[PDB]
Enzyme design. Sequence first.
Site: not given
Lengths: 268, 268, 268
Positions: A126-127, A144
């Site tokens: 994620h991200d 992340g």
Amino acid sequence: AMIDKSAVIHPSSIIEEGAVIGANVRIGPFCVIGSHVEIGEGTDIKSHVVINGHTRIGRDNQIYQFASIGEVNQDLKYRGEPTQVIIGDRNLIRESVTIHRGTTQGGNITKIGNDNLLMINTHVAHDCIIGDRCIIANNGTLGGHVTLGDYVIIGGMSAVHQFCQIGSHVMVGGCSGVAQDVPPFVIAQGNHATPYGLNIEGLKRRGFAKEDLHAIRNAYKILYRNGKTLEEAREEIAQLAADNNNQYVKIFSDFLENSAKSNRGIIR
Amino acid sequence: AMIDKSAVIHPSSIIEEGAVIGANVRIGPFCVIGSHVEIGEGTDIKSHVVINGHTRIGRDNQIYQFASIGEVNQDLKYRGEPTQVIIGDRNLIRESVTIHRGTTQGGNITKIGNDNLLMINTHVAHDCIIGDRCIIANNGTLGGHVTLGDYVIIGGMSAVHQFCQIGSHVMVGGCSGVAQDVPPFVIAQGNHATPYGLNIEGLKRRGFAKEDLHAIRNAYKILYRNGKTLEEAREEIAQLAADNNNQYVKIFSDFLENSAKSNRGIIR
Amino acid sequence: AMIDKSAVIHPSSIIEEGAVIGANVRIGPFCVIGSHVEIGEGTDIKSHVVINGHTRIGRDNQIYQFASIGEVNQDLKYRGEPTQVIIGDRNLIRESVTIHRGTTQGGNITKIGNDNLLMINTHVAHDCIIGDRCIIANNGTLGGHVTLGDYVIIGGMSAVHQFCQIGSHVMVGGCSGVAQDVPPFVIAQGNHATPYGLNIEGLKRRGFAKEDLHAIRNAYKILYRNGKTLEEAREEIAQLAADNNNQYVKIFSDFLENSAKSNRGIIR
Ligand SMILES: O=[P-]([O-])[O-]
């Protein structure tokens, strides 16, 4: 309706109402495409592919079997928010690659640029932010909020810890654990990874001028080999960006200024 | 008959007659559920999931795409016996996880408790035992007959060799090979893994009182950082658990006594 | 129709016109078999398997779910030529294994012999050659043009760099990166992998006599434990195989002579 009449979708696949399938897209059997997915023109999707979430895929991408794109991330703080995956053009996404949606706390977006190669079982958490013309070898993993610059090579079975920034033209060796920021143009190797010199053999294929190699190695020498501290090795490289005005020294300088904003530090 | 009325199964998935499916269960498309599988109430199974063998799955589980649960193990001594997988409640089983069935020579059961997170590509081999609230990061691998206590963290791309015992509240670093037993509350890193003190960050995260920390740290000094042999350390630590009745010093000595029944030894 | 009438194919699977499927073949649901695939008698193919390209599979193979065999390789110099995969008999191909087709520049063929075990998430890159009775543990990776002899063991999460040759009866330890050639009977471990004596447990399990062990131990000392250069030891090893006529010293000598035709060298 929202599926272009020139797209070729195998009947067995499940395309959720609302998905946007561009012209000349091809989708193989046993795929599952979510209702908020957008797939740009010319993209080729093999069999057994799962694409869901608020996901935008650009043009002329190739996505191989058992890949999972846009899925709920592995962050325990995710609460079902409509976060995004954004994938650019002409990327190669091999078998069993996982690309997870972002988090609101981390900027809402997992983003991938153009002309990238993600080899088998590559994980993009994620991200993450991947630039252009990167290569992540088999079983590569990004934590992340990891940022990759342009022309980054992540070796096989290597992991980048969360929030770490990888400068442009970096090469990470196989089976390496990156726990800090990696300045541009350098080779990272070990567990944890340490600077192994410059990525000279890679920079030469890009077509770098011979006296641009010397300007870069001077910044590397000042940062790592002159025995100076972070702030003192940062003042010198920033001074060279204004006196000699070498575009690569300024890039090498811009990275260190942005890495100073966080308490991560750089590999050494 | 054996499928509850409130369960929602996608018509494309294949459920052999005999599979017991609980209430409020959701099964996505392109799944295969064997005839000796039991799915507890509230469990969510996404697309492209394979579940067979004599497998019992508890309540409120989430099993993501391309996972395999209950499949024939990789032990060459296995000869098709009806061995079991048992999975508890509220487990997060991410993409491409494999959980294999036990062997009759190993105890017949591969067992996983409650509230665990098995990240992408996690492997749980035959006859493994996983307690509660454990975390196995991406590509983590458990060899056969491995036992995990409670609140164990296995870092990404790490492997626990067969028969090895990981005590509760242990943190194994990323890209680490564990070849001997790891006492509870200890950090293990490297290949082969060696101890690096207490998992102080995990214990303070789980609300450990300040008195419990100094009690556990003293037991650590006795084991590793006092020059005393394994036999001598076990005697003092056992004397501490009996005198002070501390619940975590007891868990520490109990692990050492159970590890003493084998010849693997502890990491050092 | 070339599908044998005794074969049992689940109706959900897609068998393209042109695939040849021998007698007693079983194919689970949700498979995709290309039009240039040949599958030999008794071979068992589980669900969610993709097999395409010009691929010939022998007899009595077991191919588990989410495996991909014959897919376009990851070599960026490949250009859709009709290259091949050849797989022998009685191989065990576990979940999510990938075996890619060859390249015209590298011999056109990816070849696998008989009685091999490819554990979960094994990758066999383009133009690889695997002999007989080899074992590749979880997450093992062979780069392009890699050759494995017979009875080779690759530990879990280990990688063999491209073009490297692995001799027969070699055991590569877990989490090791092999960057050069590994002579037969040798234990290789580390990153990069270095030699650590003979695979004594493997040789004795396969019934190697003690007179054979002493000769191999003697050939090992000349190559590694006597300060002799590669040219010196290779000439002396070749003299031992001509004099004593030990069948395993000859295998040891033949490997060194074939490896001398390249510039990779051997691990040390
Ligand atoms: O490189 P991997 O063994 O941590």
